[PDB]
Design a protein around this ligand. Structure first.
Ligand SMILES: O=C1CC[C@H](N2C(=O)c3ccccc3C2=O)C(=O)N1
Ligand SMILES: [Zn+2]
Length: 107
């Protein structure tokens, strides 16, 4: 019942529990943006069904050495999180907003 993560707003398949990545020791990171919004961000090595938009940027990055791009649900356009790139071990990963995903079984 806990294996697949889907978009909460439309059901698009996004990631899997098996693809969780413990960045800095924890797959979960609680962070704030410049607009004062708090997010519980889950780190994943891999995700699918997103649409990555905009130019990568280092500004305000919560993960040192990475640049981010906005990750939208590719089906509904809900903002699900960010794609990180340009770093090391790993080079890239996804930080997705936990409350914007629904977790459940494969069937
Ligand atoms: O690592 C990240 C991802 C992007 C995220 N972020 C936002 O959520 C945001 C909203 C408004 C203006 C600027 C930002 C920005 O850098 C942020 O603050 N850090
Ligand atoms: Zn969606």
């Amino acid at each position: 019942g806990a294996s697949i993560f889907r978009c909460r707003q439309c059901g698009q398949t996004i990631s899997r529990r098996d693809w969780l990545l413990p960045m800095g020791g924890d797959h979960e990171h609680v962070v704030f943006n410049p607009a004062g919004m708090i997010f519980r961000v889950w780190c994943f090595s891999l995700a699918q069904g997103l649409r990555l938009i905009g130019a990568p940027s280092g500004e305000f990055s919560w993960f040192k050495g990475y640049d981010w791009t906005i990750a939208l649900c590719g089906q509904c356009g809900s903002h699900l999180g960010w794609h990180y790139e340009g770093g090391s071990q790993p080079q890239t990963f996804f930080g997705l907003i936990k409350d914007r995903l629904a977790e459940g079984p494969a069937d």
